[PDB]
Paper text:
Depletion of [name] gene in Caulobacter cells results in severe defects in cell growth, cell division, cell size, DNA replication, chromosome segregation/condensation and gene expression. Our current studies clearly demonstrate that free [name] is a tetramer, but not a dimer. Taken all together, there exist both major conformation and minor conformation for free [name] in solution, which are in dynamic exchange equilibrium with each other.
A comparison of this [name] dimer structure with that of the dimer-unit from the open tetramer complex revealed that the backbone heavy atom RMSD for residues 16–65 is 0.32 Å, while residues 66–89 show larger deviations for both protomers. SAXS analysis results indicated that the experimental Rg value of the free Caulobacter [name] in solution is 28.6 Å, much larger than the calculated Rg (22.8 Å) based on this [name] dimer structure. Comparison of the calculated scattering curves from the [name] dimer structure and the experimental SAXS data of the free [name] shows a fitting χ2 value of 21.9, indicating the solution structure of free [name] can not be like this dimer structure. Analysis of the [name] dimer structure, it is apparent that the hydrophobic areas (residues 78–87) on the second α-helices are fully exposed, while the same hydrophobic areas in the closed tetramer participate in the formation of the tetrameric interface. It is possible that the dimer structure can not stably exist alone due to hydrophobic aggregation, when the C-terminal hydrophobic areas are fully exposed due to the disruption of the tetrameric interfaces for [name]ΔC3, GapRD68A and GapRY82A mutants. }{}$$\begin{equation*}\ R{{\rm g}_{{\rm app}}} = \sqrt {\left( {{C_{\rm A}}Rg_{\rm A}^2 + {C_{\rm B}}Rg_{\rm B}^2} \right)/\left( {{C_{\rm A}} + {C_{\rm B}}} \right)} \end{equation*}$$\end{document} where CA and CB are the mass concentration of the major and minor conformers with radii of gyration of RgA and RgB, respectively. If the minor conformer is a dimer, then its radius gyration RgB (22.8 Å) is even smaller than RgA (26.9 Å) of the major conformer (closed tetramer), which can only result in a Rgapp that is smaller than RgA based on the above equation. Taken together, the possibility can be ruled out for the closed tetramer to dissociate into dimer in free [name].
Author numbering:
A (entry chain A), B (entry chain A): 11 to 87
Write the structure that this text describes.
């Protein structure tokens, strides 16, 4: 059995996660809409998605290079 | 070569998709934070996630039952 406080906690957890998952689905739908718009303008959607992935990978690489920089500087001092 | 209007279109597409993908990542992080909070309260996160999936499946089932209802009613009229 779950006591009163725990039942409240559970209900709050489910409520918040479900609201966030609705927002996430809304965002995903908007991304789909932007790509559909692009397709309408004559763009290649598969290639656009690849452009986005490549740029994401570049940003990730730069962040890890910042981490590595802090590691080296730390080690040197 | 891409003409002026097409270059503007491309830049707008990438800009909007990347902003939306940042929002999506923010939402995913918030979901993680809610589950971390739940774990702190003594809840089983794996089981919570399963609760959320089950409820999502129930909602999906109800939507498809509404679709099927419209199909049957349509066919009958």
């Amino acid at each position: 059995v779950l006591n009163s406080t725990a039942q409240g906690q559970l209900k709050s957890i489910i409520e918040r996660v479900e609201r966030l998952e609705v927002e996430k689905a809304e965002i995903m739908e908007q991304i789909k809409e932007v790509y559909a718009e692009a397709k309408g303008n004559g763009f290649d959607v598969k290639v656009l998605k690849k452009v986005v992935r490549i740029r994401k990978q570049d940003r990730a690489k730069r962040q890890e290079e910042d981490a590595i920089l802090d590691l080296y500087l730390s080690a040197i001092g």
